[PDB]
Amino acid sequence: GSEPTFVVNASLLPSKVLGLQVQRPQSFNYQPGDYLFIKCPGISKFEWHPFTISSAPEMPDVLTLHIRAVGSWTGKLYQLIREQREEWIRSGSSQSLPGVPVYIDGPYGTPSTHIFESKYAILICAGIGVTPFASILKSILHRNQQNPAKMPLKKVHFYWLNREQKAFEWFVELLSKIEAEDTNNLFDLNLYLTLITGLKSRTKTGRPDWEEIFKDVAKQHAPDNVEVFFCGPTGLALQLRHLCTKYGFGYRKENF
Numbered sequence: 001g002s003e004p005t006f007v008v009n010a011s012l013l014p015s016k017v018l019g020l021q022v023q024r025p026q027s028f029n030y031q032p033g034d035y036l037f038i039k040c041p042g043i044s045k046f047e048w049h050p051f052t053i054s055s056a057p058e059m060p061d062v063l064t065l066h067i068r069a070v071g072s073w074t075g076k077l078y079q080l081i082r083e084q085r086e087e088w089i090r091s092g093s094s095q096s097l098p099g100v101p102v103y104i105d106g107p108y109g110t111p112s113t114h115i116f117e118s119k120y121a122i123l124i125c126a127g128i129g130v131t132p133f134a135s136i137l138k139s140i141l142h143r144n145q146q147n148p149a150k151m152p153l154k155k156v157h158f159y160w161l162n163r164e165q166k167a168f169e170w171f172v173e174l175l176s177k178i179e180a181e182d183t184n185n186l187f188d189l190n191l192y193l194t195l196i197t198g199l200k201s202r203t204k205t206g207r208p209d210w211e212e213i214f215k216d217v218a219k220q221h222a223p224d225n226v227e228v229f230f231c232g233p234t235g236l237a238l239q240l241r242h243l244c245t246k247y248g249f250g251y252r253k254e255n256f
């Protein structure tokens with residue numbers, strides 16, 4: 001469903017990322033991993049772009065999008081949002097900050113939502129590809145504070161790759177909250193720069209040794225099935241696909 005709504009707040013995070021907060025319509029229900037298409041008439045009256053909903057649907061009045069400035073439309077959105085914020089804060093208030101009007105269409109599903117019904121999962125993501133796993137990790141927390149054993153997911157192995165140390169800041173609060181509340185060791189968090197994070201989990205360096213990682217995760221969960229969920233570059237997808245076949249892991253072709 002297509003509805004007018006508003007960017008009611010934004011943050012400016014490292015590597016040119018917008019942390020948009022968007023007013024959630026009453027009708028709009030989503031599941032973690034879902035994306036939507038957004039139109040910003042101030043940027044283009046006719047163009048729709050897709051973004052992962054980086055918030056969990058248990059958060060009640062806003063959706064969140066983490067949009068990285070990589071080209072024309074995302075660059076213009078970044079520059080509109082920067083300038084509007086630079087201005088209203090040079091020119092105090094009198095009002096609240098006005099919403100940027102936008103239309104949203106969705107939500108749209110992804111097979112990543114099947115994590116909640118998996119026994120053992122590997123999440124692998126690179127850069128802003130983290131966004132659906134940000135939604136999903138937050139959901140996994142809310143759901144364990146609600147129905148403690150009602151979920152069949154027993155172990156989440158998380159691997160987040162970045163070229164730039166500063167990119168870890170997008171979700172370091174969330175990764176910290178996971179390291180606080182994870183007494184029962186549901187999660188194995190793994191950050192690779194390709195610590196200074198400030199987590200108990202030490203930031204590793206270089207391209208991960210995926211052959212050794214798969215060998216280990218297979219050994220831990222045999223003779224059970226492991227599901228690999230991947231959001232990132234296609235060169236990495238080809239390698240993860242060969243490795244999923246070698247060790248009998250679930251894979252969805254999402255990379256062309």
Ligand SMILES: Cc1cc2nc3c(=O)[nH]c(=O)nc-3n(C[C@H](O)[C@H](O)[C@H](O)COP(=O)(O)OP(=O)(O)OC[C@H]3O[C@@H](n4cnc5c(N)ncnc54)[C@H](O)[C@@H]3O)c2cc1C
Pocket residue numbers: 035049050051052053066067068069070071072073074075128131132
């Ligand atoms: C399901 C889904 C979820 C997504 N979730 C997110 C998300 O959460 N956050 C996020 O930031 N992004 C996300 N994206 C990506 C996104 O939707 C942007 O449209 C793209 O990220 C922004 O388009 P743009 O106009 O700003 O860039 P473009 O101007 O289209 O440029 C995009 C890239 O293509 C290159 N390019 C452009 N033209 C050419 C050319 N002629 N030759 C060669 N290379 C060219 C550019 O150099 C750049 O690397 C998602 C995409 C999908 C499908």
Ligand SMILES: NC(=O)c1ccc[n+]([C@@H]2O[C@H](COP(=O)([O-])OP(=O)(O)OC[C@H]3O[C@@H](n4cnc5c(N)ncnc54)[C@H](OP(=O)(O)O)[C@@H]3O)[C@@H](O)[C@H]2O)c1
Pocket residue numbers: 126127128129130161162163194207208230231232233234235236254255
């Ligand atoms: N899953 C999908 O549907 C899909 C489809 C296409 C792309 N994407 C998007 O692509 C983004 C990243 O791709 P990009 O074009 O921006 O490339 P990129 O900048 O090269 O990717 C950024 C990160 O990926 C690592 N990486 C790249 N190729 C790798 C490989 N073969 N093996 C291991 N690590 C590798 C980089 O490490 P190095 O510094 O060593 O390069 C870096 O940490 C993600 O944010 C994702 O959202 C998603």
Ligand SMILES: O=C1c2ccccc2-c2cc(N3CCC4(CC3)OCCO4)nc3cccc1c23
Pocket residue numbers: 052110128129130131132231253254255
């Ligand atoms: O930055 C990207 C991105 C950049 C260029 C190309 C694709 C993406 C991207 C794609 C993506 N897909 C694309 C393929 C999909 C939905 C999941 O639709 C058909 C199979 O599954 N899911 C994504 C989630 C977060 C970020 C991104 C993405």
